From Swiss-Prot:
InterPro entries: 4-PPantetheinyl_Trfase_dom (IPR008278), 4-PPantetheinyl_Trfase_dom_sf (IPR037143), 4PPT_N (IPR041354), Enbac_synth_compD-like (IPR003542). Its EC number is 2.7.8.7. This is 4'-phosphopantetheinyl transferase PptT. The gene is pptT. Transfers the 4'-phosphopantetheine moiety from coenzyme A to a Ser of acyl-carrier-protein. Involved in post-translational modification of various type-I polyketide synthases required for the formation of both mycolic acids and lipid virulence factors. Acts on Pks13, Mas, PpsA, PpsB, PpsC and PpsD. Also acts on AcpM, the meromycolate extension acyl carrier protein. In addition, is involved in the activation of the acyl carrier protein MbtL and the nonribosomal peptides synthases MbtB and MbtE, which are involved in the biosynthesis of the siderophore mycobactin. It comes from the Bacteria. GO terms for molecular function: holo-[acyl-carrier-protein] synthase activity; magnesium ion binding.
């Protein structure tokens, strides 16, 4: 079983998390009939990864004692987790993953996987603030593609934020600061929210702490609130 995503999960709430990942689409996976409408008009690549990522979601939920069931799609694409559960899903070339948590210990999860590849510069200025572009090179080893790592953290931030607020969060609306561990391939980040953080219940979101990792040609990030 693969354990790349454990490199970005916390120990403090680990017993209330579970995860499952795969690196390709198993052949011949049939969609659940209740989930098939979600991909009824989708291209084959989207259908195949959707079915794999939902499979990972149910394996991870089963570890937390949740019986397998369909996971529908809600406001703005967000997955509809079973009662008492939270989680997040991601895919990219070579990666499909789910991390889920018990809501009584975990308020929200956001994860993202990317290929550890450059982004174009025009995609970088649209996805970053000036202070990020100044500070990332100061805090990240020169071997790493900081543009891509910053973007991966932006995506995990939106996924952790949206289920709590049900509002947009733009690339300009969170300033993310990083640190690198002395081993050079993992570290921590903090996403500072620059807009109103009001949530549907509980205290407003102001800073979201996460972890990042680069390995096996992938960037992984996770935020567990
Ligand atoms: C929604 C988004 C973050 C998804 O990320 P992605 O890199 O395109 O794709 P991933 O495979 O990593 O993640 C897709 C999964 O995200 C989840 N997701 C989609 N919308 C979501 C939402 N509103 N809230 C939480 N999770 C959501 C879904 O599980 C989806 O997979 P599924 O359709 O198979 O269920 C991205 O497409 C997007 O729209 N980003 C713009 C918002 C943003 O990044 N703001 C910057 C904040 S600092
Ligand atoms: Na457990
Ligand atoms: Na695999
Ligand atoms: Na559902
Ligand atoms: Na969610
Ligand atoms: Na990809
Ligand atoms: Na360094
Ligand atoms: Na600012
Ligand atoms: Na910050
Ligand atoms: Na930084
Ligand atoms: Na590592």
């Amino acid at each position: 079983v693969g354990t790349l995503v454990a490199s970005v999960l916390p120990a403090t709430v680990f017993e209330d998390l579970a995860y499952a990942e795969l690196y390709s689409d198993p052949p011949g996976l049939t969609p659940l009939p209740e989930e098939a409408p979600l991909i009824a008009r989708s291209v084959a690549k989207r259908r195949n990864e959707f079915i794999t990522v939902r499979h990972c979601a149910r394996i991870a939920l089963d570890q937390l004692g949740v019986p397998p069931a369909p996971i529908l799609k809600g406001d703005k694409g967000e997955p509809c987790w079973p009662d008492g559960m939270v989680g997040s899903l991601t895919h990219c070339a070579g990666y499909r993953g789910a991390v889920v948590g018990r809501r009584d210990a975990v308020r929200s999860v956001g994860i993202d996987a990317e290929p550890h590849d450059v982004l174009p510069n025009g995609v970088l200025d649209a996805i970053s603030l000036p202070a990020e572009r100044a500070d990332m090179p100061r805090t990240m080893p020169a071997a790493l593609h900081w543009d891509r790592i910053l973007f991966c953290a932006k995506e995990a931030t939106y996924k952790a934020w949206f289920p709590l607020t049900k509002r947009w969060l733009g690339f300009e609306d969170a300033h993310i600061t990083f640190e690198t561990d002395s081993t050079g391939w993992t570290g921590r980040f903090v996403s500072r929210i620059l807009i109103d953080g009001s949530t549907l219940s509980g205290p407003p979101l102001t800073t979201l702490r996460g972890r990042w990792s680069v390995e096996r040609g992938l960037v992984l990030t996770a935020i567990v609130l």
